[PDB]
Short mmCIF file of C-alpha atoms in Angstrom, two decimals:
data_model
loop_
_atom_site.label_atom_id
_atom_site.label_comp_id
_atom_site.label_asym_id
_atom_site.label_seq_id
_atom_site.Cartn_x
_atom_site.Cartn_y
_atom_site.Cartn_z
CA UNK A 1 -13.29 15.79 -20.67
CA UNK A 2 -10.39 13.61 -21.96
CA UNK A 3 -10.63 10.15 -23.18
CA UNK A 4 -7.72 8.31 -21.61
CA UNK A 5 -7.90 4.40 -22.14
CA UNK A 6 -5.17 1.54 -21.45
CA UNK A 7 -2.83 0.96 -24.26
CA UNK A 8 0.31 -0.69 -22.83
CA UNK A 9 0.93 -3.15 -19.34
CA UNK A 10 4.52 -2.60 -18.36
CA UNK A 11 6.29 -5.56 -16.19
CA UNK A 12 10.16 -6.31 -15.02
CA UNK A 13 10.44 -4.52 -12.13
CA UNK A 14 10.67 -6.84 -9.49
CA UNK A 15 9.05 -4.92 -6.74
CA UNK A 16 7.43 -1.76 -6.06
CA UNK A 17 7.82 0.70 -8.81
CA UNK A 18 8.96 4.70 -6.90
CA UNK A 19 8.90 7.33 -10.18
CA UNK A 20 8.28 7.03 -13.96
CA UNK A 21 9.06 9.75 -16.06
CA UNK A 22 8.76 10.96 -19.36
CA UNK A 23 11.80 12.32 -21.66
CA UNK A 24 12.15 15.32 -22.21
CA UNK A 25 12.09 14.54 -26.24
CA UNK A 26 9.39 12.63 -25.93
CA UNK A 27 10.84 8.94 -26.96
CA UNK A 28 11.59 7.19 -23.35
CA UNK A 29 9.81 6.19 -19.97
CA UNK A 30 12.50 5.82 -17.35
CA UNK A 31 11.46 3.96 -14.27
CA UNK A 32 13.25 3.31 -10.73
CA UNK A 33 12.41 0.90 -8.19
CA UNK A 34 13.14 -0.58 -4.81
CA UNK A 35 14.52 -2.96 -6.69
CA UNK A 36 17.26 -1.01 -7.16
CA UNK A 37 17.34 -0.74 -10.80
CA UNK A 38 16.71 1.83 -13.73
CA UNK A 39 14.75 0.57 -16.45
CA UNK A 40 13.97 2.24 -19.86
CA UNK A 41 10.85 1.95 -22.28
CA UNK A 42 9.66 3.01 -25.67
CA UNK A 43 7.19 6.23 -24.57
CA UNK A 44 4.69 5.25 -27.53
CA UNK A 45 4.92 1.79 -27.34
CA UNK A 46 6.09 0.33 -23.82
CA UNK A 47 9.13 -1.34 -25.69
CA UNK A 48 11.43 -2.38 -23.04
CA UNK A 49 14.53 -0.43 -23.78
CA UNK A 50 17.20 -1.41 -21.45
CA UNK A 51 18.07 -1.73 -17.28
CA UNK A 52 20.42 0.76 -15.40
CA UNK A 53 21.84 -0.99 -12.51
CA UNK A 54 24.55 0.48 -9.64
CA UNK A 55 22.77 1.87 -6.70
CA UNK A 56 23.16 -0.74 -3.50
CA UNK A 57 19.65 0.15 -2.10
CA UNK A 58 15.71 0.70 -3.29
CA UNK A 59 15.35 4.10 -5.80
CA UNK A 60 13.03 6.14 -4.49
CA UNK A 61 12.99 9.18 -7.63
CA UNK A 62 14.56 9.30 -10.84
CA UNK A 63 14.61 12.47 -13.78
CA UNK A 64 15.77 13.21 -17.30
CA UNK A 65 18.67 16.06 -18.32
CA UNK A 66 16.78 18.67 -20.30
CA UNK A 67 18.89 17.05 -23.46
CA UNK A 68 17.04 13.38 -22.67
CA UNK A 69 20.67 12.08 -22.61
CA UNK A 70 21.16 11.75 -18.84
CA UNK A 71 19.30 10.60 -15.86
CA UNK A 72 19.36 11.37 -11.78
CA UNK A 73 18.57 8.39 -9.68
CA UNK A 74 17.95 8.93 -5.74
CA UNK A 75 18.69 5.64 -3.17
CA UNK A 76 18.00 4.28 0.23
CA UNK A 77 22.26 4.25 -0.21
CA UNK A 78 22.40 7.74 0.12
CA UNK A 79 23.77 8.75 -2.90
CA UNK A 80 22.17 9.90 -6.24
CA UNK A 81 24.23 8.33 -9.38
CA UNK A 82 24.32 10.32 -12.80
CA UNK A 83 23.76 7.95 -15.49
CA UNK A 84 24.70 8.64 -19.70
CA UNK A 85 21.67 6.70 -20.99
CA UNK A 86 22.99 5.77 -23.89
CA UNK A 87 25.81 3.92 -22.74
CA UNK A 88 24.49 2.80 -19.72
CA UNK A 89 27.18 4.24 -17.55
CA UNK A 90 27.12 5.80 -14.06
CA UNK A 91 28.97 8.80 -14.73
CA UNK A 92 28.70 10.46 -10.99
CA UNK A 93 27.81 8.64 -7.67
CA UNK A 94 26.77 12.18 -5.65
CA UNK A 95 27.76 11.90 -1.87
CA UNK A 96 26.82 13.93 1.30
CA UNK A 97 23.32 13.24 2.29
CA UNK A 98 23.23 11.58 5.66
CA UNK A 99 19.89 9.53 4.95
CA UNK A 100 18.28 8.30 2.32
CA UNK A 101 17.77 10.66 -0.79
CA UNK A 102 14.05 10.65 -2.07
CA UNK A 103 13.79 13.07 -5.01
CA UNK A 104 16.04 14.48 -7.45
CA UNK A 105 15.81 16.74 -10.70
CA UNK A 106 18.17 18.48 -12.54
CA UNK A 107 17.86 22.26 -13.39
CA UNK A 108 16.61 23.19 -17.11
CA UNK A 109 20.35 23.86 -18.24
CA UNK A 110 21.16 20.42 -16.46
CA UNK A 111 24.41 21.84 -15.37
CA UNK A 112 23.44 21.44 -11.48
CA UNK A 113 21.04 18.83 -9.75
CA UNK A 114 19.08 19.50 -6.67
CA UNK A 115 17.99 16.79 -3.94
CA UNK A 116 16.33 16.09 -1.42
CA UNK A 117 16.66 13.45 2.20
CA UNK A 118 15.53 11.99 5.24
CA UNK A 119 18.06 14.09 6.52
CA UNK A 120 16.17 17.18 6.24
CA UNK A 121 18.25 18.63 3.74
CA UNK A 122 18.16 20.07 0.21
CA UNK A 123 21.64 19.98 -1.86
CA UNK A 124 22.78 21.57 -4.87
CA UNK A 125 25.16 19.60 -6.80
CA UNK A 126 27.34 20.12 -9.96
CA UNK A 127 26.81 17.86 -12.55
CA UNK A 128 30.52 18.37 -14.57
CA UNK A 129 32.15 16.96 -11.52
CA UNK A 130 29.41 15.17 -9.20
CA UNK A 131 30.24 17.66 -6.31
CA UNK A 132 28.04 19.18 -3.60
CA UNK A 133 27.47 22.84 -4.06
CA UNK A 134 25.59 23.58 -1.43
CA UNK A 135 23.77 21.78 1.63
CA UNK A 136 20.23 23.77 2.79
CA UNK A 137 19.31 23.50 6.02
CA UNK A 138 15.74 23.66 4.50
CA UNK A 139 13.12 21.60 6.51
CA UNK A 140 13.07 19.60 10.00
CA UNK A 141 11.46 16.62 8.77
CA UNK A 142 12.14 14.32 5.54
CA UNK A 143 12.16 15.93 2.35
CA UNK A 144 9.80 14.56 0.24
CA UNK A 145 10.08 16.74 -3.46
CA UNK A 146 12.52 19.24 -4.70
CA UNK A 147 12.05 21.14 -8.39
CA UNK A 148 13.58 24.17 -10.00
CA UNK A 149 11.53 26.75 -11.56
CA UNK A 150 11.61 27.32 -15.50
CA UNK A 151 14.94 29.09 -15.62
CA UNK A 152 16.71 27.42 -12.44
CA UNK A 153 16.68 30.71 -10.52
CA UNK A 154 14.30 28.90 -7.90
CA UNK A 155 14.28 25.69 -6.43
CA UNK A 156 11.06 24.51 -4.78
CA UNK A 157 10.97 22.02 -1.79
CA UNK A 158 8.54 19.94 0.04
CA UNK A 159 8.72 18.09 3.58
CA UNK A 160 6.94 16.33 6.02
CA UNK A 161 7.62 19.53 8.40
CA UNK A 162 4.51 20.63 6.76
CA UNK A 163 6.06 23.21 4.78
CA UNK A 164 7.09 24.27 1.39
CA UNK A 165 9.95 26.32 0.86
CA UNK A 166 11.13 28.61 -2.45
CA UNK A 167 15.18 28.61 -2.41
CA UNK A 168 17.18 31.27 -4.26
CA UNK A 169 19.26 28.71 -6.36
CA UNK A 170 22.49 31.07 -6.57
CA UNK A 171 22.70 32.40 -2.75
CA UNK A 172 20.95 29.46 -0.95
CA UNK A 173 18.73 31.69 0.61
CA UNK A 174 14.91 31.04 2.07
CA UNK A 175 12.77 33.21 0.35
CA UNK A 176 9.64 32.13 0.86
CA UNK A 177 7.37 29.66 3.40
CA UNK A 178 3.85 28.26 2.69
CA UNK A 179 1.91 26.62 4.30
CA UNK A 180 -1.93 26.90 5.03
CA UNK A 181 -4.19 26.32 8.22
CA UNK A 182 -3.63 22.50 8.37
CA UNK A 183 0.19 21.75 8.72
CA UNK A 184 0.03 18.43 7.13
CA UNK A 185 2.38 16.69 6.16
CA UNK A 186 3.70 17.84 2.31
CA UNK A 187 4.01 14.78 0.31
CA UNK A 188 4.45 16.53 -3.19
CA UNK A 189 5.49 19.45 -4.76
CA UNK A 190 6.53 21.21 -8.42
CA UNK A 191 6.19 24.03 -9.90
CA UNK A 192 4.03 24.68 -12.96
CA UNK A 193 5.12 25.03 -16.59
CA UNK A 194 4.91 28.34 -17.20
CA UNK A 195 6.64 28.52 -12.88
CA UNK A 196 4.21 31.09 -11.61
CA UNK A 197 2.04 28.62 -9.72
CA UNK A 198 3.59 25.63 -7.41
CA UNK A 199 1.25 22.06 -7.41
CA UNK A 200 1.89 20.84 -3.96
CA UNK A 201 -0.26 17.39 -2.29
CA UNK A 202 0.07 16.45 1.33
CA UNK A 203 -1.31 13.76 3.03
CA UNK A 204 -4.53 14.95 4.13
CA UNK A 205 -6.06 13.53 0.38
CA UNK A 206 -5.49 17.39 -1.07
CA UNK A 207 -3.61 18.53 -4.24
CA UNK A 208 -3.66 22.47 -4.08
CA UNK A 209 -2.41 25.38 -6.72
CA UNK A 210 -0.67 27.97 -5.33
CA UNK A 211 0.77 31.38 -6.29
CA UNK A 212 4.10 30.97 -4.45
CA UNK A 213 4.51 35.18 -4.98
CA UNK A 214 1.59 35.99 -3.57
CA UNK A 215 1.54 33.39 -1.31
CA UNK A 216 -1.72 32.21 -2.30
CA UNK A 217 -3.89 28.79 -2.69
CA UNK A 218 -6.07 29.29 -5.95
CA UNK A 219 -6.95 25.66 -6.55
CA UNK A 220 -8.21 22.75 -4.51
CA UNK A 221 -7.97 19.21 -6.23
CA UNK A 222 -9.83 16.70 -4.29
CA UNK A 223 -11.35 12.77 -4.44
CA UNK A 224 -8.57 11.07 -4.74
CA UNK A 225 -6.68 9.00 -1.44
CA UNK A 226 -3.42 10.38 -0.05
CA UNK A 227 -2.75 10.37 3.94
CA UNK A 228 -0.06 7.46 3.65
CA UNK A 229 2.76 8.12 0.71
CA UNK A 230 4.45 10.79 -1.64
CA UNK A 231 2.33 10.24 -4.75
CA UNK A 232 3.42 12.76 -8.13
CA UNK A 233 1.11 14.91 -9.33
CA UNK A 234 1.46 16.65 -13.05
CA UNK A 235 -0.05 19.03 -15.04
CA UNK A 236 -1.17 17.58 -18.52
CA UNK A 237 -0.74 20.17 -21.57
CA UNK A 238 -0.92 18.31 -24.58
CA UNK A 239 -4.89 18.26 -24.80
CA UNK A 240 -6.95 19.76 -22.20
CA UNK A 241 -5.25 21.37 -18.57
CA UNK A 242 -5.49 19.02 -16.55
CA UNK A 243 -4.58 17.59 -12.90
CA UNK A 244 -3.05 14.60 -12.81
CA UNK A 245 -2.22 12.44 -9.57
CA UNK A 246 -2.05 9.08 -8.04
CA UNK A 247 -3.88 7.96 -5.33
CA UNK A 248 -3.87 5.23 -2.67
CA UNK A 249 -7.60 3.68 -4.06
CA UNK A 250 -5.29 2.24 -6.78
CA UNK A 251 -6.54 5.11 -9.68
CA UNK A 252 -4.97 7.75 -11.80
CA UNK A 253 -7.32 11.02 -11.01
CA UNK A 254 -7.56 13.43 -13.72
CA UNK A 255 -9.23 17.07 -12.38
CA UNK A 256 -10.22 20.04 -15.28
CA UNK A 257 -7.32 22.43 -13.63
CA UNK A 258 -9.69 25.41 -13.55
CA UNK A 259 -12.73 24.40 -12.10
CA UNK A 260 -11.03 21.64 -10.19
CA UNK A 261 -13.73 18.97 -11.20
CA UNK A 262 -12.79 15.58 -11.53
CA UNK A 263 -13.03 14.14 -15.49
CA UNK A 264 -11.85 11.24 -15.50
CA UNK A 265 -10.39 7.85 -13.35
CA UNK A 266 -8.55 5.41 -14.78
CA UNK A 267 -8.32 1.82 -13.38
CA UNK A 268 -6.31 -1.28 -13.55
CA UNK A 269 -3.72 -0.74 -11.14
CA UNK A 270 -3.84 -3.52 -7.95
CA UNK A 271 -1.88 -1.31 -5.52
CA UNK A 272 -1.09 2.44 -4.48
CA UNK A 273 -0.54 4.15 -7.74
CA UNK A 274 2.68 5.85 -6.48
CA UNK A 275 3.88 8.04 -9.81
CA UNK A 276 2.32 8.91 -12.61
CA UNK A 277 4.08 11.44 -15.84
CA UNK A 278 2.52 13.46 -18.31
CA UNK A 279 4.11 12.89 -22.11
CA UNK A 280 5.28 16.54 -23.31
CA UNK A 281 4.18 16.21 -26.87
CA UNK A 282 1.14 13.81 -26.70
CA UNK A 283 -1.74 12.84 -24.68
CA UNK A 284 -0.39 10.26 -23.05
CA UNK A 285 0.22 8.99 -19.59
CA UNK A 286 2.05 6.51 -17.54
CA UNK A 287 1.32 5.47 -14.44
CA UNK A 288 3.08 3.41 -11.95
CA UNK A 289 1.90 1.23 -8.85
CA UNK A 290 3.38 -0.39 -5.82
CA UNK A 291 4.12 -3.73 -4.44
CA UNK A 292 1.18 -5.41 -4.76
CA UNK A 293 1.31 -4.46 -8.30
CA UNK A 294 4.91 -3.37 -9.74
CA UNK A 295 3.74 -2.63 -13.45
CA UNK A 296 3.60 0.08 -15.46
CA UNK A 297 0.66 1.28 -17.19
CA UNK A 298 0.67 3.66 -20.33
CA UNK A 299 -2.32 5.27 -21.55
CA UNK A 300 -3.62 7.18 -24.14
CA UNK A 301 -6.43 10.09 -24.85
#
């Protein structure tokens, strides 16, 4: 079992906190909000870095460039923005979605980014010059998570169709469909580390492991509350392998990823804790929470 107690209270945001995510090299916590805004922190201390500010609507996802120096904020404005960090400056304001945007990541050689909508799409977009590459006709319902794979040759998606979807990044094409008895709605998806498993949560309180190849659930993570929003889930490396998620009874659930037990809850939040990240070099976790709420929490095994 891990050993994860509160270290850091995060405030600022001035309402409900969407996505908090770890840098890639380990030194930032990025944050987006419906209030619009981008805000950085010190990963090991909370240190409030600085605020990213552009996008004319709430931020409903944001994620780091493989290099740590760029982000990928998605909007209730339709647009994602590409932001240098460093500088502060929106670099790219990516057009084309018809409806809000609600997740966004770039690919692991953060030359393309890949997005998802309300308007049942999934786009491709070039990150040089902030251009669609391709628009997916991948779901029928609101897109709620989209994710490459470890080399970019696959994108994953997620919708409240009840379906997830594995894209060939290069032609665009459907090549797989999951989706088990239930067709709830899929709140959550990504694909492991090591790519050959996809972590997927819909809103019938279930996280589930599957081998997308095979087409096969291995894992059931339950005990935690999810049947209203599009909570993250991670897998946690550093220490143990773990299963880390959310949940709508204001904790952070932490499951042993093999025999899908639950080890640990962590509480403090006052609201739906709608995001929580996984630090790639240490044991330590941040976790987000909404309205009601609006702080970040960082923790530490």
């Amino acid at each position: 079992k891990p050993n994860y107690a509160l270290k850091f209270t995060l405030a600022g945001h001035t309402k409900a906190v969407s996505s908090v995510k770890f840098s890639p090299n380990g030194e930032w916590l990025a944050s987006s909000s419906a209030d619009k805004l981008i805000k950085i922190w010190g990963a090991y201390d909370g240190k409030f870095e600085k605020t990213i500010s552009g996008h004319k609507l709430g931020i409903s996802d944001v994620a780091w460039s493989s290099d740590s120096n760029l982000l990928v904020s998605a909007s209730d404005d339709k647009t994602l923005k590409i932001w240098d960090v460093s500088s502060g400056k929106c670099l790219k304001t990516l057009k084309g979605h018809s409806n809000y945007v609600f997740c966004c990541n770039f690919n692991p050689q953060s030359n393309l980014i890949v997005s998802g909508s309300f308007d049942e799409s999934v786009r491709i977009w070039d990150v040089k010059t902030g251009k669609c590459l391709k628009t997916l006709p991948a779901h029928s319902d609101p897109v709620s998570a989209v994710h490459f794979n470890r080399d970019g040759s696959l994108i994953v998606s997620s919708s409240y169709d009840g379906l997830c979807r594995i894209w060939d990044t290069a032609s665009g094409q459907c090549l797989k469909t999951l989706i088990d008895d239930d067709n709830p709605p899929v709140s959550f998806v990504k694909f492991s580390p090591n790519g050959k498993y996809i972590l997927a949560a819909t809103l019938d309180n279930t996280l589930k492991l599957w081998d997308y190849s095979k087409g096969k659930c291995l894992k059931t993570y339950t005990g935690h509350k999810n049947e209203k929003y599009c909570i993250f889930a991670n897998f946690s490396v550093t220490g143990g392998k773990w299963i880390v998620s959310g949940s709508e009874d204001n904790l952070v659930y932490i499951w042993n990823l093999q025999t899908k037990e639950i080890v640990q809850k962590l509480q403090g939040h006052t609201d739906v804790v709608i995001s929580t990240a996984c630090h790639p070099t240490e044991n330590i976790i941040a976790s987000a929470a909404l309205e009601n709420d609006k702080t970040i929490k960082l923790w530490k095994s």
